[PDB]
């Protein structure tokens, strides 16, 4: 974000849980898990202006 002290430090205290398809407790997938993946592996390397 504004100051990426997280990527730099390598820590991931705030990224592991930002979307539904992220690791769910006890490996219990959340609903919609079939699409968000398909909609973020698509928009990866393509910026937003062209993720839209």
């Amino acid at each position: 974000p504004f100051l990426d002290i997280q990527k730099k430090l390598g820590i991931s205290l705030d990224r592991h849980f930002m979307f539904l398809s992220a690791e769910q407790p006890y490996k219990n997938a959340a609903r919609c898990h079939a699409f968000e993946k398909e909609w973020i592996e698509c928009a990866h390397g393509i910026g937003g202006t062209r993720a839209k």
Binding site: F17, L20, A22, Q24, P25, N28, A30, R31, C32
Partner: protein, 96 residues
Amino acid sequence: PSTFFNLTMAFSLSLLGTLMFRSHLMSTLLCLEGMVLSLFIMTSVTSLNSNSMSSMPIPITILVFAACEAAVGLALLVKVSNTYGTDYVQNLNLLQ
């Protein structure tokens, strides 16, 4: 669904409240809280029907921060009816 529009309007009705004081600081500090309940209920509701368990931490973090927030708010309130003998807002007009 509609359930969400009721909660959202509850937050707006609570919004209209905090933004229109009626001579009672306590009442406001009480309206303010009405929002936090509406936010807590809405966050919990969607997290629950999205089966998004990774996010349930938030519904509570919201309450924990909101409680202290209110603690600070009430200490200011007690401070005011110690300096002016009332919580009435009109008294708070020295900074003009």
